[PDB]
């Protein structure tokens, strides 16, 4: 019933793990790939969809300098939430400053 | 370079250009293509709506069939707010107050007695011969008469030609609206089309004068290059490079493909969100930003449930 | 009721019982369609 | 490659109209030629799936293994049944009852016309 | 047969623009101005209403 699997490199290596994100596509995995690549503790972050008939993405996160790849994945999720909350705030504050000039101009 | 959050909270701005009913056009300065495409692709296929799923016929004695009528009804925008409703749980044909809506399209067609002498105009000869979408009686079920006003659960347009009838010919069906996203079936998509484009910059590398400026003003879309007089000569300058359709017609001209540098401006998108009317376009974009967040919340919840330590 | 049938050219509701000559009882045209009644068929809108 | 949304909105939707001309003396032939379409009252095979005269309903969806017509030898009463032996899902569209060239033929010829929807699936050619 | 409720390419409701397009062509507009003045700006939306053979006014003549 869960919707994230983690597939290690050799059962012991925790730097490379390929996250299998169930019920996603290039909507999330292209913007996660954008955030995790902004982390200088990542040698390699890329994604692929497994097969278009399927509904999951593979996400290879490959960390240099002794970190597990759960930390760039969590940081790239929170660091995308903190993009979208701010985009939501500056969008709900420019719709409001447009309705407050459509109305309060000549009416 | 790393992700400076105060470089994003300093160089991001949404500039709304034109917003009215069932349309919106705005900017997003300073955002890369991987988040902008995520917003576009959640507007088209992941922001949910209500749409007709099951049709219950009795006496479809019409030329429009029993199947094409049902598919044609499913593509009709229903003006119920999606967020008040849940997904109908699977394997449940009968619905309840939370999941389903019901309409009823009951139209008979009978000959017109009056105002019909020696004419052939069809409105004067028949009554109910164009089944429009204002013929859908909302049959409220359970306790939905109290949650919603009299005349809010409604087809959006009320001018859509469903069928076309003749005397004797009847439609008596009943519908069941459900909730879904625009990936299960594209009758659930709330947007006409949501799309973005970069902002063009047109740079005159050389001062154009005289008979070449009027040639340059017609190689772009009407509105871009204005040709105004400055001491006897007709110089040309750029003016609203946003209007340029980027058709590259100036690179067909040999004398003037060396006096423009037609390119684009990085990360200066211009969206355009046209709704089908189910929700206004400023709530579709907010409920497109608020679905990418939920996709990011669900996976952090999964990681919190996986590791205990 | 018996099953209503409709003639092709004069449109009379003829009620063909199973033991008669099939013909329309006004004009006599031989092809006779069948009348659609009320029953529930469920079609998906997909 | 076809856009899926455009397919779901109605791009090249169609139909195909199977029409089976059923006679009960050119195909089924044992003796006395008393084969009229009919039901015996109280037959579990045709309960609420065929009409009260032996032909199917109009608008009724049919699948593989549904009753399709039921006819009645009037000499004894032994009503038979025949089942819909095709693969695809069909909808009964109109049912024309045909006499002979005079107009005194007995109720033993019919020509059931059936819609089959047949949208673009993968493997259909443009 | 009858006008589609939505344009095939992008899902714009064009299914309400058939009577108010015959009404503009009966009132002497050109088709290059009876489509812009209905708000069909993309050439996939214009396509649905310009090249449409409404083949149900010919099919209802065969009516009981
Ligand atoms: Zn007759
Ligand atoms: Zn279109």
From Swiss-Prot, chain B:
Protein role: DNA-dependent RNA polymerase catalyzes the transcription of DNA into RNA using the four ribonucleoside triphosphates as substrates. Common component of RNA polymerases I and III which synthesize ribosomal RNA precursors and short non-coding RNAs including 5S rRNA, snRNAs, tRNAs and miRNAs, respectively. POLR1C/RPAC1 is part of the polymerase core and may function as a clamp element that moves to open and close the cleft.
This protein's name: DNA-directed RNA polymerases I and III subunit RPAC1
Compartmental location: Nucleus; Nucleus, Nucleolus; Cytoplasm, Cytosol
Gene Ontology CC terms: cytoplasm; cytosol; fibrillar center; nucleoplasm; nucleus; RNA polymerase I complex; RNA polymerase III complex
GO molecular function: DNA binding; DNA-directed RNA polymerase activity; protein dimerization activity
Lineage, highest ranks first: Eukaryota, Metazoa, Chordata, Craniata, Vertebrata
Gene3D superfamilies given in the database record: DNA-directed RNA polymerase, insert domain, RNA polymerase, RBP11-like subunit
Family: Belongs to the archaeal Rpo3/eukaryotic RPB3 RNA polymerase subunit family.
From Swiss-Prot, chain C:
Zn finger residue spans: C4-type: 7-27
Location in the cell: Nucleus; Nucleus, Nucleolus
The organism's place on the tree of life at top rank: Eukaryota
Molecular functions (GO terms): DNA binding; DNA-directed RNA polymerase activity; zinc ion binding
UniProt-listed GO biological process terms: regulation of transcription by RNA polymerase I; transcription by RNA polymerase II; transcription by RNA polymerase III
UniProt: Zn(2+) binding residues: 7, 10, 24, 27
GO CC, alphabetical: cytosol; nucleoplasm; nucleus; RNA polymerase I complex; RNA polymerase II, core complex; RNA polymerase III complex
Main localization of the protein described in the UniProt heading: nucleus
UniProt keyword annotations, A-Z: DNA-directed RNA polymerase, Metal-binding, Nucleus, Transcription, Zinc, Zinc-finger
Family: Belongs to the archaeal Rpo12/eukaryotic RPC10 RNA polymerase subunit family.
Quaternary structure and partners: Component of the RNA polymerase I (Pol I), RNA polymerase II (Pol II) and RNA polymerase III (Pol III) complexes consisting of at least 13, 12 and 17 subunits, respectively. Pol I complex consists of a ten-subunit catalytic core composed of POLR1A/RPA1, POLR1B/RPA2, POLR1C/RPAC1, POLR1D/RPAC2, POLR1H/RPA12, POLR2E/RPABC1, POLR2F/RPABC2, POLR2H/RPABC3, POLR2K/RPABC4 and POLR2L/RPABC5; a mobile stalk subunit POLR1F/RPA43 protruding from the core and additional subunits homologous to general transcription factors POLR1E/RPA49 and POLR1G/RPA34.
Stated name of the protein: DNA-directed RNA polymerases I, II, and III subunit RPABC4
Organism listed in the record: Homo sapiens (Human)
Gene: POLR2K
Residues of the full protein shown: 13 to 58 of 58
From Swiss-Prot, chain D:
Protein's cellular compartments: Nucleus, Nucleolus; Chromosome
Taxonomic superkingdom: Eukaryota
Domain description: The active site comprises the fork loops, the loops and the rudder that stabilize the transcription bubble and assist polymerase translocation.
Disorder named in the UniProt entry: Treacher Collins syndrome 4: A form of Treacher Collins syndrome, a disorder of craniofacial development. Treacher Collins syndrome is characterized by a combination of bilateral downward slanting of the palpebral fissures, colobomas of the lower eyelids with a paucity of eyelashes medial to the defect, hypoplasia of the facial bones, cleft palate, malformation of the external ears, atresia of the external auditory canals, and bilateral conductive hearing loss. TCS4 inheritance pattern is autosomal dominant.
Physiological role: Catalytic core component of RNA polymerase I (Pol I), a DNA-dependent RNA polymerase which synthesizes ribosomal RNA precursors using the four ribonucleoside triphosphates as substrates. Transcribes 47S pre-rRNAs from multicopy rRNA gene clusters, giving rise to 5.8S, 18S and 28S ribosomal RNAs. Pol I-mediated transcription cycle proceeds through transcription initiation, transcription elongation and transcription termination stages.
Family: Belongs to the RNA polymerase beta chain family.
Name of the protein in its database record: DNA-directed RNA polymerase I subunit RPA2
Swiss-Prot record, chain E:
Molecular function (Gene Ontology), one example: DNA binding
UniProt-listed InterPro entries: RNA_pol_su_RPB10 (IPR023580), RNA_pol_suN_Zn-BS (IPR020789), RPABC5/Rpb10 (IPR000268)
Keyword Transport: no
Any GO BP annotation: transcription by RNA polymerase I
Subcellular location: Nucleus; Nucleus, Nucleolus
Primary localization: nucleus
Residues reported to bind Zn(2+): 7, 10, 44-45
GO cellular component: cytosol; nucleoplasm; nucleus; RNA polymerase I complex; RNA polymerase II, core complex; RNA polymerase III complex
Zinc as UniProt keyword: yes
Range of residues in the leader sequence: none
Pfam families for this protein: RNA_pol_N
Subunit structure comment from the entry: Component of the RNA polymerase I (Pol I), RNA polymerase II (Pol II) and RNA polymerase III (Pol III) complexes consisting of at least 13, 12 and 17 subunits, respectively. Pol I complex consists of a ten-subunit catalytic core composed of POLR1A/RPA1, POLR1B/RPA2, POLR1C/RPAC1, POLR1D/RPAC2, POLR1H/RPA12, POLR2E/RPABC1, POLR2F/RPABC2, POLR2H/RPABC3, POLR2K/RPABC4 and POLR2L/RPABC5; a mobile stalk subunit POLR1F/RPA43 protruding from the core and additional subunits homologous to general transcription factors POLR1E/RPA49 and POLR1G/RPA34.
Protein's job: DNA-dependent RNA polymerase catalyzes the transcription of DNA into RNA using the four ribonucleoside triphosphates as substrates. Common component of RNA polymerases I, II and III which synthesize ribosomal RNA precursors, mRNA precursors and many functional non-coding RNAs, and a small RNAs, such as 5S rRNA and tRNAs, respectively.
Protein name: DNA-directed RNA polymerases I, II, and III subunit RPABC5
């Amino acid at each position: 019933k869960t919707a994230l699997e983690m597939v290690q490199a050799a059962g012991t290596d925790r730097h490379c793990v390929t996250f299998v994100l169930h019920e996603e596509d290039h909507t999330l995995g292209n913007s996660l790939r954008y955030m995790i690549m902004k982390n200088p503790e990542v040698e390699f972050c890329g994604y692929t969809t497994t097969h278009p008939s399927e509904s999951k993405i593979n996400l290879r996160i490959q960390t240099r300098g002794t970190l597990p790849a759960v930390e760039p994945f969590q940081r790239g999720l929170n660091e995308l939430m903190n993009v979208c909350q701010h985009v939501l705030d500056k969008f709900e504050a420019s719709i409001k400053d447009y309705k407050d000039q459509k109305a309060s101009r000549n009416e | 370079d790393a992700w400076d959050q105060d470089r994003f909270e300093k160089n991001f701005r949404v500039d709304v250009v034109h917003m009215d009913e069932n349309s919106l056009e705005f900017d997003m300065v300073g955002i890369d293509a991987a988040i902008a495409n995520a917003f576009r692709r959640i507007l088209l296929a992941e922001v949910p709506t209500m749409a007709v799923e099951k049709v219950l016929v009795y006496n479809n004695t019409s030329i429009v069939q029993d199947e094409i009528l049902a598919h044609r009804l499913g593509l009709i925008p229903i003006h119920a707010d999606p967020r008040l409703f849940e997904y109908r749980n699977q394997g449940d044909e009968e619905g309840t107050e939370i999941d389903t809506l019901q309409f009823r399209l009951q139209v008979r067609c009978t000959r017109n007695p009056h105002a019909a002498k020696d004419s052939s105009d069809p409105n004067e000869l028949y009554v109910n011969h164009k089944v429009y979408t204002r013929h859908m009686t909302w049959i409220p079920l359970g306790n939905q008469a109290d949650l919603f006003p009299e005349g809010t659960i409604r087809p959006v347009h009320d001018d859509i030609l469903i069928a076309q009838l003749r005397p004797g010919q009847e439609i008596d069906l009943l519908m069941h609206c459900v909730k879904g996203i625009g990936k299960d079936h594209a009758k659930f998509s709330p947007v006409a089309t949501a799309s973005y484009r970069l902002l063009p910059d047109i740079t005159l590398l050389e001062p154009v004068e005289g008979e070449a400026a009027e040639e340059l003003s017609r190689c772009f879309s009407p509105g871009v290059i204005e040709v105004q007089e400055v001491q006897g000569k007709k110089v040309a300058r750029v003016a609203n490079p946003r209007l340029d359709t980027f058709s590259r017609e100036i690179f067909r001209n040999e004398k003037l493909k060396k006096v423009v540098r037609l390119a684009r401006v990085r990360d200066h998108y211009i969206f355009s969100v046209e709704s089908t009317g189910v929700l206004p376009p400023d709530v579709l974009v907010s409920e497109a930003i608020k679905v990418l967040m939920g996709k990011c919340r669900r996976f952090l919840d999964e990681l919190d449930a996986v590791q205990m330590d | 009721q018996p099953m209503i049938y409709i003639c092709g050219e004069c449109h009379t509701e003829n009620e063909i019982k199973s033991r008669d000559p099939i013909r329309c009882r006004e004009c006599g045209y031989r092809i006779m369609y069948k009348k659609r009644t009320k029953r529930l068929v469920v079609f998906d809108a997909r | 490659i076809v856009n899926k949304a455009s397919w779901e909105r109605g791009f090249a939707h169609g139909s195909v109209y199977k029409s089976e001309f059923i006679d009960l003396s050119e195909k089924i032939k044992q003796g006395d030629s008393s084969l009229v379409f009919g039901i015996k009252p109280g037959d579990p095979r045709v309960l609420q799936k065929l009409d009260d005269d032996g032909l199917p309903f109009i608008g009724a969806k049919l699948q593989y293994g549904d009753p399709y017509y039921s006819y009645l030898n009037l000499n004894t009463g032994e009503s038979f049944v025949m089942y819909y032996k095709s693969k695809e899902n069909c909808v009964v569209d109109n049912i024309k009852v045909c006499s002979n060239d005079t107009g005194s033929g007995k109720f033993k010829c019919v020509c059931i016309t059936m819609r089959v929807p047949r949208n673009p699936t993968i493997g259909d050619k443009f | 047969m009858i006008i589609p409720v939505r344009c095939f390419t992008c899902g714009k409701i064009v299914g309400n623009k058939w009577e108010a397009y015959l009404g503009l062509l009966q009132a002497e507009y050109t088709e290059g101005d009876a489509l812009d003045a209905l708000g069909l700006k993309r050439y996939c939306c214009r396509r649905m209403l310009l090249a449409h053979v409404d083949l149900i006014e010919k099919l209802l003549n065969y009516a009981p």
